């Protein structure tokens, strides 16, 4: 469920959201803290879901690292509300 009292985009074209987005700004959590040059890459799955590939640079380990997840629309693909899991 989205937070209470927020607007979700309701004219949503999934295909046009695909590819690579740079992360300009984030509220910090353990998953991301200290990571640099972050991007998320979205692609269409057979089951109608999205693949999510999160990528960032880890200065303390001196390596590029990625997190692999999938996203599912909670309602209709025209409304941009989704659930994400990482495995």
């Amino acid at each position: 469920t989205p937070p209470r009292g927020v607007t979700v985009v309701n004219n949503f074209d999934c295909k046009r959201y695909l590819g690579t987005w740079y992360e300009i700004a984030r509220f910090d959590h353990r998953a991301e803290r200290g990571l640099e040059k972050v991007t998320a890459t979205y692609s269409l799955r057979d089951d109608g879901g999205l693949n999510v590939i999160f990528k960032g640079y880890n200065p303390d380990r001196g390596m590029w690292q990625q997190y692999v997840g999938k996203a599912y629309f909670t309602g209709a693909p025209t409304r941009a509300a989704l659930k994400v899991a990482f495995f």
């Binding site: 607007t7 985009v9 987005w21 740079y22 300009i24 984030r26 040059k37 998320a40 941009a80 509300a81």
Partner: protein, 64 residues
């Protein structure tokens, strides 16, 4: 976890994204940097929907 696009321009170049609650929020661009103009409009949508924007970490990107 919840994932929700709560703002998006007309050519899908700039997005505001939040989690299931007001502790999770991201500003994303197709470019590594955005303009002040674009920043202020994003902050202005965040504030209008009740997000504490003082929590933003401004992520290192090429050109920033």
């Amino acid at each position: 976890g919840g994932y929700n696009v709560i703002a998006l321009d007309r050519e899908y170049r700039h997005a505001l994204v939040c989690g299931p609650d007001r502790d999770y929020l991201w500003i994303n661009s197709r470019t590594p940097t955005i303009s002040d103009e674009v920043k202020q409009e994003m902050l202005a949508v965040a504030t209008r929907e009740g997000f504490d924007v003082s929590k933003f970490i401004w992520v290192q990107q090429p050109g920033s």
